[PDB]
Design a protein around this ligand. Structure first.
Ligand SMILES: [Mg+2]
Ligand SMILES: [Mg+2]
Ligand SMILES: [Mg+2]
Ligand SMILES: [Mg+2]
Ligand SMILES: [Mg+2]
Ligand SMILES: [Mg+2]
Ligand SMILES: [Mg+2]
Ligand SMILES: [Mg+2]
Ligand SMILES: [Mg+2]
Ligand SMILES: [Mg+2]
Ligand SMILES: [Mg+2]
Ligand SMILES: [Mg+2]
Ligand SMILES: [Mg+2]
Ligand SMILES: [Mg+2]
Ligand SMILES: [Mg+2]
Ligand SMILES: [Mg+2]
Ligand SMILES: [Mg+2]
Ligand SMILES: [Mg+2]
Ligand SMILES: [Mg+2]
Ligand SMILES: [Mg+2]
Ligand SMILES: [Mg+2]
Ligand SMILES: [Mg+2]
Ligand SMILES: [Mg+2]
Ligand SMILES: [Mg+2]
Ligand SMILES: [Mg+2]
Ligand SMILES: [Mg+2]
Ligand SMILES: [Mg+2]
Ligand SMILES: [Mg+2]
Ligand SMILES: [Mg+2]
Ligand SMILES: [Mg+2]
Ligand SMILES: [Mg+2]
Ligand SMILES: [Mg+2]
Ligand SMILES: [Mg+2]
Ligand SMILES: [Mg+2]
Ligand SMILES: [Mg+2]
Ligand SMILES: [Mg+2]
Ligand SMILES: [Mg+2]
Ligand SMILES: [Mg+2]
Ligand SMILES: [Mg+2]
Ligand SMILES: [Mg+2]
Ligand SMILES: [Mg+2]
Ligand SMILES: [Mg+2]
Ligand SMILES: [Mg+2]
Ligand SMILES: [Mg+2]
Ligand SMILES: [Mg+2]
Ligand SMILES: [Mg+2]
Ligand SMILES: [Mg+2]
Ligand SMILES: [Mg+2]
Ligand SMILES: [Mg+2]
Ligand SMILES: [Mg+2]
Ligand SMILES: [Mg+2]
Ligand SMILES: [Mg+2]
Ligand SMILES: [Mg+2]
Ligand SMILES: [Mg+2]
Ligand SMILES: [Mg+2]
Ligand SMILES: [Mg+2]
Ligand SMILES: [Mg+2]
Ligand SMILES: [Mg+2]
Ligand SMILES: [Mg+2]
Ligand SMILES: [Mg+2]
Ligand SMILES: [Mg+2]
Ligand SMILES: [Mg+2]
Ligand SMILES: [Mg+2]
Ligand SMILES: [Mg+2]
Ligand SMILES: [Mg+2]
Ligand SMILES: [Mg+2]
Ligand SMILES: [Mg+2]
Ligand SMILES: [Mg+2]
Ligand SMILES: [Mg+2]
Ligand SMILES: [Mg+2]
Ligand SMILES: [Mg+2]
Ligand SMILES: [Mg+2]
Ligand SMILES: [Mg+2]
Ligand SMILES: [Mg+2]
Ligand SMILES: [Mg+2]
Ligand SMILES: [Mg+2]
Ligand SMILES: [Mg+2]
Ligand SMILES: [Mg+2]
Ligand SMILES: [Mg+2]
Ligand SMILES: [Mg+2]
Ligand SMILES: [Mg+2]
Ligand SMILES: [Mg+2]
Ligand SMILES: [Mg+2]
Ligand SMILES: [Mg+2]
Ligand SMILES: [Mg+2]
Ligand SMILES: [Mg+2]
Ligand SMILES: [Mg+2]
Ligand SMILES: [Mg+2]
Ligand SMILES: [Mg+2]
Ligand SMILES: [Mg+2]
Ligand SMILES: [Mg+2]
Ligand SMILES: [Mg+2]
Ligand SMILES: [Mg+2]
Ligand SMILES: [Mg+2]
Ligand SMILES: [Mg+2]
Ligand SMILES: [Mg+2]
Ligand SMILES: [Mg+2]
Ligand SMILES: [Mg+2]
Ligand SMILES: [Mg+2]
Ligand SMILES: [Mg+2]
Ligand SMILES: [Mg+2]
Ligand SMILES: [Mg+2]
Ligand SMILES: [Mg+2]
Ligand SMILES: [Mg+2]
Ligand SMILES: [Mg+2]
Ligand SMILES: [Mg+2]
Ligand SMILES: [Mg+2]
Ligand SMILES: [Mg+2]
Ligand SMILES: [Mg+2]
Ligand SMILES: [Mg+2]
Ligand SMILES: [Mg+2]
Ligand SMILES: [Mg+2]
Ligand SMILES: [Mg+2]
Ligand SMILES: [Mg+2]
Ligand SMILES: [Mg+2]
Ligand SMILES: [Mg+2]
Ligand SMILES: [Mg+2]
Ligand SMILES: [Mg+2]
Ligand SMILES: [Mg+2]
Ligand SMILES: [Mg+2]
Ligand SMILES: [Mg+2]
Ligand SMILES: [Mg+2]
Ligand SMILES: [Mg+2]
Ligand SMILES: [Mg+2]
Ligand SMILES: [Mg+2]
Ligand SMILES: [Mg+2]
Ligand SMILES: [Mg+2]
Ligand SMILES: [Mg+2]
Ligand SMILES: [Mg+2]
Ligand SMILES: [Mg+2]
Ligand SMILES: [Mg+2]
Ligand SMILES: [Mg+2]
Ligand SMILES: [Mg+2]
Ligand SMILES: [Mg+2]
Ligand SMILES: [Mg+2]
Ligand SMILES: [Mg+2]
Ligand SMILES: [Mg+2]
Ligand SMILES: [Mg+2]
Ligand SMILES: [Mg+2]
Ligand SMILES: [Mg+2]
Ligand SMILES: [Mg+2]
Ligand SMILES: [Mg+2]
Ligand SMILES: [Mg+2]
Ligand SMILES: [Mg+2]
Ligand SMILES: [Mg+2]
Ligand SMILES: [Mg+2]
Ligand SMILES: [Mg+2]
Ligand SMILES: [Mg+2]
Ligand SMILES: [Mg+2]
Ligand SMILES: [Mg+2]
Ligand SMILES: [Mg+2]
Ligand SMILES: [Mg+2]
Ligand SMILES: [Mg+2]
Ligand SMILES: [Mg+2]
Ligand SMILES: [Mg+2]
Ligand SMILES: [Mg+2]
Ligand SMILES: [Mg+2]
Ligand SMILES: [Mg+2]
Ligand SMILES: [Mg+2]
Ligand SMILES: [Mg+2]
Ligand SMILES: [Mg+2]
Ligand SMILES: [Mg+2]
Ligand SMILES: [Mg+2]
Ligand SMILES: [Mg+2]
Ligand SMILES: [Mg+2]
Ligand SMILES: [Mg+2]
Ligand SMILES: [Mg+2]
Ligand SMILES: [Mg+2]
Ligand SMILES: [Mg+2]
Ligand SMILES: [Mg+2]
Ligand SMILES: [Mg+2]
Ligand SMILES: [Mg+2]
Ligand SMILES: [Mg+2]
Ligand SMILES: [Mg+2]
Ligand SMILES: [Mg+2]
Ligand SMILES: [Mg+2]
Ligand SMILES: [Mg+2]
Ligand SMILES: [Mg+2]
Ligand SMILES: [Mg+2]
Ligand SMILES: [Mg+2]
Ligand SMILES: [Mg+2]
Ligand SMILES: [Mg+2]
Ligand SMILES: [Mg+2]
Ligand SMILES: [Mg+2]
Ligand SMILES: [Mg+2]
Ligand SMILES: [Mg+2]
Ligand SMILES: [Mg+2]
Ligand SMILES: [Mg+2]
Ligand SMILES: [Mg+2]
Ligand SMILES: [Mg+2]
Ligand SMILES: [Mg+2]
Ligand SMILES: [Mg+2]
Ligand SMILES: [Mg+2]
Ligand SMILES: [Mg+2]
Ligand SMILES: [Mg+2]
Ligand SMILES: [Mg+2]
Ligand SMILES: [Mg+2]
Ligand SMILES: [Mg+2]
Ligand SMILES: [Mg+2]
Ligand SMILES: [Mg+2]
Ligand SMILES: [Mg+2]
Ligand SMILES: [Mg+2]
Ligand SMILES: [Mg+2]
Ligand SMILES: [Mg+2]
Ligand SMILES: [Mg+2]
Ligand SMILES: [Mg+2]
Ligand SMILES: [Mg+2]
Ligand SMILES: [Mg+2]
Ligand SMILES: [Mg+2]
Ligand SMILES: [Mg+2]
Ligand SMILES: [Mg+2]
Ligand SMILES: [Mg+2]
Ligand SMILES: [Mg+2]
Ligand SMILES: [Mg+2]
Ligand SMILES: [Mg+2]
Ligand SMILES: [Mg+2]
Ligand SMILES: [Mg+2]
Ligand SMILES: [Mg+2]
Ligand SMILES: [Mg+2]
Ligand SMILES: [Mg+2]
Ligand SMILES: [Mg+2]
Ligand SMILES: [Mg+2]
Ligand SMILES: [Mg+2]
Ligand SMILES: [Mg+2]
Ligand SMILES: [Mg+2]
Ligand SMILES: [Mg+2]
Ligand SMILES: [Mg+2]
Ligand SMILES: [Mg+2]
Ligand SMILES: [Mg+2]
Ligand SMILES: [Mg+2]
Ligand SMILES: [Mg+2]
Ligand SMILES: [Mg+2]
Ligand SMILES: [Mg+2]
Ligand SMILES: [Mg+2]
Ligand SMILES: [Mg+2]
Ligand SMILES: [Mg+2]
Ligand SMILES: [Mg+2]
Ligand SMILES: [Mg+2]
Ligand SMILES: [Mg+2]
Ligand SMILES: [Mg+2]
Ligand SMILES: [Mg+2]
Ligand SMILES: [Mg+2]
Ligand SMILES: [Mg+2]
Ligand SMILES: [Mg+2]
Ligand SMILES: [Mg+2]
Ligand SMILES: [Mg+2]
Ligand SMILES: [Mg+2]
Ligand SMILES: [Mg+2]
Ligand SMILES: [Mg+2]
Ligand SMILES: [Mg+2]
Ligand SMILES: [Mg+2]
Ligand SMILES: [Mg+2]
Ligand SMILES: [Mg+2]
Ligand SMILES: [Mg+2]
Ligand SMILES: [Mg+2]
Ligand SMILES: [Mg+2]
Ligand SMILES: [Mg+2]
Ligand SMILES: [Mg+2]
Lengths: 16, 275, 48
RNA sequence: UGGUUCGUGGAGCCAUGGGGGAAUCUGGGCGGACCACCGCCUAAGGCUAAGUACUCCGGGUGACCGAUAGCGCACCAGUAC
RNA sequence: GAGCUAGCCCUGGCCAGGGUGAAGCUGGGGUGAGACCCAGUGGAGGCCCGAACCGGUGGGGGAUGCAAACCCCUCGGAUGA
RNA sequence: GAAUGCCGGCAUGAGUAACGAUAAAGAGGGUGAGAAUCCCUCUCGCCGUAAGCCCAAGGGUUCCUACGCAAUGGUCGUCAGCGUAGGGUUAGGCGGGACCUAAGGUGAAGCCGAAAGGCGUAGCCGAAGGGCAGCCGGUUAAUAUUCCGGCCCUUCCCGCAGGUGCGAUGGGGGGACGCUCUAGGCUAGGGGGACCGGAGCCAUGGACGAGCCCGGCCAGAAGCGCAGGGUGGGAGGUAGGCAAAUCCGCCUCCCAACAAGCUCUGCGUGGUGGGGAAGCCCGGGUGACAACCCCCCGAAGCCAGGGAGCCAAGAAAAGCCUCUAAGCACAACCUGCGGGAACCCGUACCGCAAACCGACACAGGUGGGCGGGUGCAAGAGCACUCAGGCGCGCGGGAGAACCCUCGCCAAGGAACUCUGCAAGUUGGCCCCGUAACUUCGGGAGAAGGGGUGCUCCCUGGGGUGAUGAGCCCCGGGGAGCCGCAGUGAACAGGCUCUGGCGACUGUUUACCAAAAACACAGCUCUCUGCGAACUCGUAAGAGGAGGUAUAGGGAGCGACGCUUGCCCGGUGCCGGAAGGUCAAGGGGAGGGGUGCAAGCCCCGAACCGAAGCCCCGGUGAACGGCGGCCGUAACUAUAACGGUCCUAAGGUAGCGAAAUUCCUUGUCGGGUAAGUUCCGACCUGCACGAAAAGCGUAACGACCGGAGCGCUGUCUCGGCGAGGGACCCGGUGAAAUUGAACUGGCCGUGAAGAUGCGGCCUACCCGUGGCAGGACGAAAAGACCCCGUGGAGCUUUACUGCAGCC
RNA sequence: CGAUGUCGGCUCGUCGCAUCCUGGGGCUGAAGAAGGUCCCAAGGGUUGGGCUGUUCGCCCAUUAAAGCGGCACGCGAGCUG
RNA sequence: CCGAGGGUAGGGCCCGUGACUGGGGCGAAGUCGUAACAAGGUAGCUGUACCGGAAGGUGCGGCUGGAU
RNA sequence: GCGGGGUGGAGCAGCCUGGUAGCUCGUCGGGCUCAUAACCCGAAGGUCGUCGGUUCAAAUCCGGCCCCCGCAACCA
């Protein structure tokens, strides 16, 4: 998931 | 003789406890105890200055008589031998013919019911206290003052003893528990005999909880930390030291001597310790 | 879950109160500033 | 070592943390290492108005603002929150 | 700023019920005396099962939420570090 | 006119999502302008170790009553924790203060620091700990251990009587203590009664009954009784308890001991004072002259400072008692009795929550006590239910897709998939029975089975009582009865075989990782002789430790078993009174400036001159490192063997395609119909290897592999059903997003992926429910990557400083 | 680069034809049967399983056959991870 | 009721076989060294321990079945 | 992609600094021994991987080619 921290777009919820 | 346990839990496999054979009295002398201010390794700033301390059993401090020249000539009776949680030795309760009650630490072989006494004219007998100059050469001895009237400092832990090697002016030569050869002033008091509870060193704590009971909090290796924390910190995966092994504060910790070089007592240490 | 504000009347007065402020140099500068600004209360109110 | 324009510079002067340590005018300091000569001044005690600075306060005046401006506040604002 | 969190200090409190059955002790056997064996008693333990309590393993839901970390099912510890 | 500009206003999305636990509602009657929503009644459902009750914190009038409905309330509202107003909180005994100390804080003395300030003995402060005197009922719309009633008690002042060497911030005793287990006797609480009191009831086939339903107590001073706790008496000596001491301590002597005596609690009784149900009738009245009795169960509470065991060895101070010193013995103190005196603050209400902490009347968080009954082996578990409290502040219909939660399924049974993920299965108790291996404990609930309800008959032991009856608790045997099914509902393990890692129970990235990571007992090295080393601090001062080498610090390794080889050339550390280098300082050959000169001033060689470095040694569980090429045996192949180069020394034992093996799905064997995984082997180990430990290892594991049995909707392959939504109607009514829009398909073109340009094709205008291919859809000025003479953490034999140490 | 979500699987298709099968053919070193090779043909069809994240590949049991490619290595506002 | 035996589950013994692996016996003329028999050129043997391509070596203690 | 190397039969010096190829083993002849090995006395064998260049002169210095080990191949 994008999500966690290797990628960064399209893919998980709010955090920022 | 340590007491073993059957392997009915993983920890009971190896746990050993003292036999408590010599103990004859299981509550302290109310007039000789005061509360021990547990510190947790914190100083008056509130800062941890000795790591990994705290959380042990509650304790009462038993006042010990480390200057037995306080009562020269007045014999006492050994009334009991009791457990002291503030030290490895056992302590002995003394009833002086004075009516005064004091605690000394209990030498090996001291039998309840015997008399002890202190002074220049005392019999060379287990439990008596004399200035070092009056004890025969060859006598093993404990609770040795290091300077006259300053209090017993040497050979106090369970089973330890110093042995008198010879005399040299106002000084006797002692072999300390560490094997160091030192000159101690002859006027210094000492108690003939070794400290009791020699079997102390053969106790196997057996589990982690037993270290917790003693106030010893878990010690964490420098290798387990990060560079902000310790010279040995970091590395990708495990990692050898990668430098001369070091304390958290930078200084080397394998062999680096740390006694102050210009210390005035060097004139009195004959030969540094053995082994 | 347990949130960060856990009101305690004794803790509030002993930490931020008038007499805690006056005890230290930084505490007095707080009162000095809040007076100069015209603050209606120099110090948190707490029932006691 | 600091001060001065002076950052070790030919580095004096003024001050002083450490060491050594006088003299009372035929004594002492200074004039940019030092020396001579020629001058200037009297250290290691103290006080001293005025001319100078500021604007919480009062007043006078604006080729200052005019309610998103002018103080954060023209109004119950260092308030509500 | 340690009213969150982390450690420590002082002082209090809490841990249903059920299971296993160490040492010791007693009796019996054994022996020169012993070690030891058997039974009973006993009730040890970072022992076992399981609420409270403390957790947060797997899955599903939730995802402008009931909630800026929650809900359900399941799961770990539960006299101890 | 643009700054993802700032402030404000108003749009779009849209009458859309949503209206906050799926515990649930229906009718009747009231009130009112208006009622699903307020009040009352009946029926229904939900909690009941709470979703009931009582404290504490926090909150701060939210409490009670009257009058109100603009806003607040996710709808409505006549209602309300909302608006307005009036009312309401009563103490010598409850809590805190006028008492005591704990950590800590502060701090006459004293110490230290440029200033600010930091320490610090006594002392003072500091409590949910110690100490201290109130129990039951009644009363208000709202307070009550507070008011009232009954019955008790405390301290202070004064007085009287009797007694006594009185007297203290001083001495002593006591207060005063852990964990686990636990005796006897009580009480709280509870079950039963064919006994006692009670308004009634007879239904629908039977019952007028030893029937049903309701209740059968609470408090109490002296005394007494039962049960416990605490406590020896006397004398002589005395140098210790920093003065004194008749006290306490120590020695001796006589008497007394599982007693008794004395003293102190608990429980019972106790003069007395209260309470008192169902049902009926309108909170009240009746019942009622209410009765208030017997049996059983029985605490974790009480007697209590009880008993036993264990090691990890379990606050202080005051009250209280005793001793004496000044003093004073007209006093003073003690004891009894009498009169008087007794202050300040809190008290409403919420309190697992709509009133506290979370912006909300928020499915979250919040410490202590009470927490009834029945059945299920027990229990605070589970189901139902009492007292009490609730139906969760939008509703009404409908009966689509699809989603959520749930039930079932023919045949098959892991064929699903990264993976049996998920869900089945198993499931409690009693009995039978249980393997390798093992550290002899374990493995173990191994595995696997059988039993389980009801009725009758016979009978063994316990508790209470009496030894008996009754009640209650553990059982034993025999004969039967019913169903598909007897832990008939609910709560309640699937199992086995075999590897890897870690010994184990523990700990961790609050909020993506619980692990093989950390810790851990244990092992080793090393430092430290005590004003220790080390750590914090400018210091004083602390910690270390009121410890003393069987101790304390640092480091690695990580139960246990068997072990841990070779290299000291480099780095580190240790030892080394020589030698080499070496700064300030000493020394002063010899120069220089200036002056008529005495002199003043400046430079200055040899030489003496620390630590450090050089140098000489030691040292591996210190940092670390542990070869290459060529040849050789009577088949071949391979080399025990040899030659030579190099090194400080050339990897030993053990292990090995491994959590390490690149080539690689190595090769062979096992398991499968089939095996890139797995297990067992082999060894040309790209690139294991011995405390960054090597090889094993019983037990343990929500760790990670592989296999099998059981069973299944995982699947072939889907079907049906339930409820909450989605849908329709009434009420309330968001959101991100948005240059404007009159916003089609193909093939091309275009900054290279076009609704918007070209050519063609297609297309009447506007919606609703649906699906997600496009609008290079939304979100977040890409985390990857580069660039910036941008930043920050970290390292070191990078540079340069500083602390610290020499 | 003020974001054009990145392998594979699943689901859902659709297109190309350089055709794997099925239909029609010519040549054959085509006796028959069965093959070989080339031509026409895209209507429809193109299995289940073991291993591996795999795409691919190998293997088992079958089959008329077990085709090859494109569609942002088709398809994450469709799922998985 | 018992009951051949069938079925489920878990044990014990024997036999055969197994990638690979351990040593053993034997085999006309292989390779390395020379341990033992002479004091076998270090007297030998020995129980144990450790080491080494190999026979062996060395330690500790023992035997004479040891020469002179 | 960068680095080192190629010389009597084997394993290595010489290459840096141009003129001179050396060390151990092996091989050949002769001793010693009954004989073999060990041992002792003599001797032989290399145009320096190859081609091209600089130079008076190349193993040596510089290029190309052949070959042999070694290191590297990272961010996606
Ligand atoms: Mg994001
Ligand atoms: Mg043991
Ligand atoms: Mg044992
Ligand atoms: Mg065990
Ligand atoms: Mg003892
Ligand atoms: Mg005391
Ligand atoms: Mg201390
Ligand atoms: Mg302090
Ligand atoms: Mg420390
Ligand atoms: Mg500590
Ligand atoms: Mg002791
Ligand atoms: Mg000690
Ligand atoms: Mg001395
Ligand atoms: Mg030890
Ligand atoms: Mg302790
Ligand atoms: Mg330790
Ligand atoms: Mg550790
Ligand atoms: Mg680390
Ligand atoms: Mg780390
Ligand atoms: Mg830090
Ligand atoms: Mg750093
Ligand atoms: Mg560091
Ligand atoms: Mg490191
Ligand atoms: Mg690391
Ligand atoms: Mg590594
Ligand atoms: Mg290491
Ligand atoms: Mg290293
Ligand atoms: Mg270091
Ligand atoms: Mg140091
Ligand atoms: Mg020493
Ligand atoms: Mg928290
Ligand atoms: Mg907040
Ligand atoms: Mg709190
Ligand atoms: Mg408070
Ligand atoms: Mg408080
Ligand atoms: Mg507080
Ligand atoms: Mg404070
Ligand atoms: Mg304060
Ligand atoms: Mg100040
Ligand atoms: Mg004001
Ligand atoms: Mg303030
Ligand atoms: Mg200056
Ligand atoms: Mg100057
Ligand atoms: Mg000076
Ligand atoms: Mg004069
Ligand atoms: Mg003059
Ligand atoms: Mg004059
Ligand atoms: Mg002069
Ligand atoms: Mg001057
Ligand atoms: Mg001048
Ligand atoms: Mg002048
Ligand atoms: Mg003067
Ligand atoms: Mg002057
Ligand atoms: Mg305005
Ligand atoms: Mg405005
Ligand atoms: Mg304006
Ligand atoms: Mg103003
Ligand atoms: Mg403004
Ligand atoms: Mg205002
Ligand atoms: Mg707190
Ligand atoms: Mg518990
Ligand atoms: Mg059991
Ligand atoms: Mg038993
Ligand atoms: Mg016993
Ligand atoms: Mg346990
Ligand atoms: Mg169990
Ligand atoms: Mg167990
Ligand atoms: Mg969870
Ligand atoms: Mg699950
Ligand atoms: Mg979230
Ligand atoms: Mg659950
Ligand atoms: Mg458990
Ligand atoms: Mg513009
Ligand atoms: Mg802007
Ligand atoms: Mg704006
Ligand atoms: Mg704005
Ligand atoms: Mg705005
Ligand atoms: Mg406006
Ligand atoms: Mg608006
Ligand atoms: Mg509009
Ligand atoms: Mg609208
Ligand atoms: Mg819409
Ligand atoms: Mg919504
Ligand atoms: Mg909702
Ligand atoms: Mg609601
Ligand atoms: Mg619920
Ligand atoms: Mg539900
Ligand atoms: Mg109805
Ligand atoms: Mg209704
Ligand atoms: Mg209504
Ligand atoms: Mg209405
Ligand atoms: Mg109502
Ligand atoms: Mg009705
Ligand atoms: Mg509030
Ligand atoms: Mg309203
Ligand atoms: Mg309204
Ligand atoms: Mg109004
Ligand atoms: Mg509203
Ligand atoms: Mg709401
Ligand atoms: Mg009305
Ligand atoms: Mg009263
Ligand atoms: Mg008063
Ligand atoms: Mg205070
Ligand atoms: Mg106080
Ligand atoms: Mg108190
Ligand atoms: Mg009180
Ligand atoms: Mg009372
Ligand atoms: Mg009234
Ligand atoms: Mg006590
Ligand atoms: Mg005590
Ligand atoms: Mg206490
Ligand atoms: Mg009672
Ligand atoms: Mg009962
Ligand atoms: Mg006396
Ligand atoms: Mg009446
Ligand atoms: Mg309790
Ligand atoms: Mg008690
Ligand atoms: Mg006592
Ligand atoms: Mg214990
Ligand atoms: Mg105290
Ligand atoms: Mg008188
Ligand atoms: Mg008296
Ligand atoms: Mg007063
Ligand atoms: Mg009240
Ligand atoms: Mg709750
Ligand atoms: Mg409420
Ligand atoms: Mg609500
Ligand atoms: Mg009841
Ligand atoms: Mg049960
Ligand atoms: Mg309870
Ligand atoms: Mg409801
Ligand atoms: Mg609720
Ligand atoms: Mg419909
Ligand atoms: Mg069902
Ligand atoms: Mg059915
Ligand atoms: Mg089925
Ligand atoms: Mg199956
Ligand atoms: Mg099956
Ligand atoms: Mg499978
Ligand atoms: Mg499928
Ligand atoms: Mg079950
Ligand atoms: Mg077994
Ligand atoms: Mg087996
Ligand atoms: Mg097994
Ligand atoms: Mg095993
Ligand atoms: Mg066993
Ligand atoms: Mg056993
Ligand atoms: Mg069993
Ligand atoms: Mg097993
Ligand atoms: Mg039966
Ligand atoms: Mg029945
Ligand atoms: Mg279970
Ligand atoms: Mg681990
Ligand atoms: Mg573990
Ligand atoms: Mg292990
Ligand atoms: Mg461990
Ligand atoms: Mg545990
Ligand atoms: Mg986390
Ligand atoms: Mg947080
Ligand atoms: Mg976080
Ligand atoms: Mg966080
Ligand atoms: Mg875990
Ligand atoms: Mg960790
Ligand atoms: Mg660890
Ligand atoms: Mg170990
Ligand atoms: Mg420091
Ligand atoms: Mg101390
Ligand atoms: Mg073992
Ligand atoms: Mg073993
Ligand atoms: Mg070895
Ligand atoms: Mg070395
Ligand atoms: Mg060396
Ligand atoms: Mg070295
Ligand atoms: Mg190094
Ligand atoms: Mg030197
Ligand atoms: Mg190393
Ligand atoms: Mg290295
Ligand atoms: Mg090295
Ligand atoms: Mg051959
Ligand atoms: Mg070796
Ligand atoms: Mg291998
Ligand atoms: Mg391996
Ligand atoms: Mg490897
Ligand atoms: Mg491989
Ligand atoms: Mg591979
Ligand atoms: Mg294969
Ligand atoms: Mg093979
Ligand atoms: Mg191989
Ligand atoms: Mg490693
Ligand atoms: Mg585990
Ligand atoms: Mg685990
Ligand atoms: Mg399987
Ligand atoms: Mg399905
Ligand atoms: Mg439905
Ligand atoms: Mg309609
Ligand atoms: Mg509407
Ligand atoms: Mg509304
Ligand atoms: Mg437009
Ligand atoms: Mg338009
Ligand atoms: Mg359109
Ligand atoms: Mg269109
Ligand atoms: Mg193009
Ligand atoms: Mg186009
Ligand atoms: Mg168009
Ligand atoms: Mg055009
Ligand atoms: Mg056009
Ligand atoms: Mg068209
Ligand atoms: Mg619609
Ligand atoms: Mg629609
Ligand atoms: Mg779409
Ligand atoms: Mg889509
Ligand atoms: Mg799209
Ligand atoms: Mg775009
Ligand atoms: Mg798109
Ligand atoms: Mg920006
Ligand atoms: Mg950017
Ligand atoms: Mg960004
Ligand atoms: Mg990141
Ligand atoms: Mg990336
Ligand atoms: Mg780039
Ligand atoms: Mg640069
Ligand atoms: Mg630049
Ligand atoms: Mg930069
Ligand atoms: Mg500095
Ligand atoms: Mg981009
Ligand atoms: Mg954007
Ligand atoms: Mg974007
Ligand atoms: Mg032919
Ligand atoms: Mg076709
Ligand atoms: Mg087609
Ligand atoms: Mg692909
Ligand atoms: Mg492949
Ligand atoms: Mg293959
Ligand atoms: Mg065919
Ligand atoms: Mg394709
Ligand atoms: Mg394409
Ligand atoms: Mg491609
Ligand atoms: Mg590609
Ligand atoms: Mg793709
Ligand atoms: Mg996705
Ligand atoms: Mg995908
Ligand atoms: Mg998308
Ligand atoms: Mg899209
Ligand atoms: Mg993932
Ligand atoms: Mg049969
Ligand atoms: Mg042969
Ligand atoms: Mg021989
Ligand atoms: Mg020989
Ligand atoms: Mg020999
Ligand atoms: Mg040897
Ligand atoms: Mg050579
Ligand atoms: Mg060379
Ligand atoms: Mg040359
Ligand atoms: Mg030669
Ligand atoms: Mg040439
Ligand atoms: Mg040439
Ligand atoms: Mg990257
Ligand atoms: Mg990188």
């Amino acid at each position: 998931s994008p999500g966690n921290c290797a990628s960064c777009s399209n893919s998980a919820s709010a955090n920022c | 003789a340590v007491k073993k346990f059957k392997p009915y839990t993983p920890s009971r496999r190896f746990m050993t406890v003292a036999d408590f054979s010599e103990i004859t009295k299981t509550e302290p002398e109310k007039s000789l105890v005061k509360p021990l201010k547990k510190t947790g390794g914190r100083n008056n700033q509130g800062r941890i200055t000795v790591r990994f301390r705290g959380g042990g059993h509650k304790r009462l401090y038993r006042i010990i008589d480390f200057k037995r020249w306080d009562k020269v000539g007045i014999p006492a009776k050994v009334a009991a031998i009791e457990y002291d949680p503030n030290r490895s030795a056992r302590i002995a309760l003394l009833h002086y013919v004075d009516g005064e009650k004091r605690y000394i630490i209990a030498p090996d072989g001291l039998q309840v019911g015997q008399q002890v006494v202190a002074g220049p004219d005392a019999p060379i007998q287990v439990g008596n206290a004399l200035p070092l100059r009056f004890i025969p050469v060859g006598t093993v001895v404990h609770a040795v003052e290091l300077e006259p009237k300053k209090g017993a400092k040497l050979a106090r832990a369970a089973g330890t003893s110093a042995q008198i090697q010879g005399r040299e002016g106002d000084y006797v030569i002692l072999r300390l528990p560490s094997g160091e050869l030192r000159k101690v002033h002859g006027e210094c008091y000492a108690t003939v005999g070794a400290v009791g509870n020699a079997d102390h060193k053969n106790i196997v704590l057996g589990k982690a909880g037993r270290s917790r009971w003693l106030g010893r909090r878990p010690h964490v290796r420098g290798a387990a930390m990060n560079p902000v924390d310790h010279p040995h910190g970091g590395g990708e995966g495990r990692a050898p030291r990668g430098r001369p092994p070091a304390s958290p504060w930078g200084w080397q910790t394998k062999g680096l001597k740390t006694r102050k070089r210009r210390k005035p007592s060097s004139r009195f240490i004959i030969a540094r310790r053995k082994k | 879950m347990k949130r960060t504000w856990q009101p305690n009347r004794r803790k509030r007065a002993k930490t931020h109160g008038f007499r805690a402020r006056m005890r230290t140099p930084g505490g007095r500068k707080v009162l000095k500033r809040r007076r100069q600004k015209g603050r209606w209360r120099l110090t948190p109110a707490v029932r006691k």
